[PDB]
Design a protein around this ligand. Sequence first.
Ligand SMILES: C[S@@+](CC[C@H](N)C(=O)[O-])C[C@H]1O[C@@H](n2cnc3c(N)ncnc32)[C@H](O)[C@@H]1O
Ligand SMILES: C[S@@+](CC[C@H](N)C(=O)[O-])C[C@H]1O[C@@H](n2cnc3c(N)ncnc32)[C@H](O)[C@@H]1O
Lengths: 390, 388
Amino acid sequence: GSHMETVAAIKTLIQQLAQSTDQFGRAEINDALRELQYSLETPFDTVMRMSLDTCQVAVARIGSDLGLFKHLSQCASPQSAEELADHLGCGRELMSRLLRYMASVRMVQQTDDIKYISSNITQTLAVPGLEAGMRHAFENLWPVLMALPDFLAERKYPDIVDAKDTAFQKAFNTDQDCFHWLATQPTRIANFKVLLTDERTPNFLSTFPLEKELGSWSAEPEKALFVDIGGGMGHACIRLREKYPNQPGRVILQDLPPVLQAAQATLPLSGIESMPHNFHTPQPVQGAKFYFLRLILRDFPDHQALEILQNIVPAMDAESRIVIDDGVPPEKGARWAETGTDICIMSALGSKERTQRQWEELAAKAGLQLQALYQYTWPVVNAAMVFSLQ
Amino acid sequence: HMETVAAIKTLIQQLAQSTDQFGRAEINDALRELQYSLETPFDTVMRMSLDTCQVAVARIGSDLGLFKHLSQCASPQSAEELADHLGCGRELMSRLLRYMASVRMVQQTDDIKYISSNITQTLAVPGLEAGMRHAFENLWPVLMALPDFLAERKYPDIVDAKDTAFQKAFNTDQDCFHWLATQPTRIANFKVLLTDERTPNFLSTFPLEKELGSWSAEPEKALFVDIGGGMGHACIRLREKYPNQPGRVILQDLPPVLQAAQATLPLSGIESMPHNFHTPQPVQGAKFYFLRLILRDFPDHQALEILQNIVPAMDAESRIVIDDGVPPEKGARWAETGTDICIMSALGSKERTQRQWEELAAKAGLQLQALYQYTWPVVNAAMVFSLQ
Ligand SMILES: C[S@@+](CC[C@H](N)C(=O)[O-])C[C@H]1O[C@@H](n2cnc3c(N)ncnc32)[C@H](O)[C@@H]1O
Ligand SMILES: C[S@@+](CC[C@H](N)C(=O)[O-])C[C@H]1O[C@@H](n2cnc3c(N)ncnc32)[C@H](O)[C@@H]1O
């Protein structure tokens, strides 16, 4: 045989195994491919990889600035480096070198006659919410990660527990915490507004046993079934009303006024209320069945997350539940997608990922006890944790 | 589910063992391509968001001395033990180790203790650690500056070392080479980085006797002039592989680098000669004038000047051997194109295909006689040039 024939055969077999399974099996296969790559690389390969994989975010940012990915995604035929350069207003040599690099990391695809077509990654980077995620990685995460090593060295490697005293303050030369500082930056606010439009899949309703959790709960008089606290575009409310259209009870999306305004266009005309509410203030809706917090508490250290829960707890009755939908990394063998997040949010927000036991300790500080845990993603675990009053 | 994954790992491991280092490199590139093709859109953005953590966390571990310590440890270590020994917060240490284990920077045991992986050992080696630190402190800033630099300037073709992303990244008018002389810690890290020797090298495929022909070392001619030879690894390996070939073997570099090289050079057989390769070549009529990973760091203008400084010293039998990257016309790999982007951003230079090398050398009056590749699939080659 030959190295090329062996490589093609590996690809053929891995592709057959991947299609055959579901999305969780494909995620497990991808994690295995990454681990194999790390185990088989040479020392020089390790250093080269660490040196050069960072180029991907910068070059994706350049392609986004140029509008290259959306343009290539709508192109019917392969495009030369000339055509793309002239159309997008880029230097021809610069464009050619960028495209060669992008093709080498599958950001685009290069044809046999050295022309260019969209890849899966091209299409992904053309989607506004995902492009906004990439831009957030470049303009928000990279600086904090840049500042983290010298920040830890200066401070003799402390345990970071405060949002106002972490790498972010050094990275952006400010006293403010990340959220307060971002509120003053219009372009970053706009990018976050676009990033909110991305909807994760799957969601908690794929495994959440709603009827069982409800039991004999009654919606009268005018009680709320579901209060989506910091619900963003209200994707959770939309999916809930879609899956259980005949279930009685108010479905309430709570967020800040600008986000609710952004959400108005894609919300259904009836069945979901938009209610301006700051979750650092007491919860107005009394005795709701579910108070839902998805990807909220992960962004706050224990003190602030506890304060958010303490703003909710006095509104609960015996049947009320607080549903924390968030990451629940394992005690051991956590994956890169749950630990890298931990490092990023430590550096930018002073917060952390929490194991199930850590979630239970935090919630017990608020007077809550865990009743059930409903995983809905694998192998990186996201779960809806249902808490009741102690 | 688990079983299938374990079987894939077993099979890929066996296939990697079945082949040589070039086959393993091809397999690794295939695994990367498969990962990119099979990831979800969300996975793509997540990977791009989080893989940046690896360099920062490796830098932290290097600052702590974690990798060398773990590399010398006889038994698995708890996060508590590592934190107390290295002077790190216990919570911070535990979170760092969890992250590192997730990317194989260390290995986590079933009882949540930690041992060295191949990557731990790699990051403990001074030259490779220095490469990682160079990526963090030198490359990252320039790459972070590149998008806004290009946007500000309406996306120009970068051709000048004094007008690229580096100037914006480090708020200076100087080119990278002038600016480095004013930075002590970066100079020290580069000094350590010079001690790393790439493998394999050109002598694995270079037909020395064939290229030599009937060339005579008599009466006192030079066989090999290593221009910008650094530690002189090429000279050392040449004398090791061809101990009986006569002729002077000369390491040329700047005085601080030659002083650094003196300790590990052999006691005899290799001359250390101070020479700035921006000035005429002093050694006349040598058989091989060797430039390894030199010209890639310069735009066409300066690289041409470097070659023109050598050409007048050549006789009919002299050859200029450019040992450098020769990426293909199409299908270039990430390790050659990422380098192209980095050196564009920092130095204003570029990677060159074989045709581009031949055009550059023809401007100096040189013609390509032979090309001897010695790495795959990323192409490094010794290109042998003679007078036109
Ligand atoms: C992770 S994002 C949205 C997550 C959303 N629950 C989801 O999964 O679809 C965080 C959300 O919290 C909102 N938010 C931030 N600060 C808030 C506050 N003080 N009061 C209410 N909502 C807030 C933001 O507007 C944003 O929509
Ligand atoms: C890529 S590093 C050394 C690579 C070396 N040829 C090898 O492959 O082993 C570049 C080398 O060029 C040297 N150098 C830089 N400027 C120089 C100059 N003006 N004259 C001579 N050497 C120089 C540096 O000291 C450094 O050793």
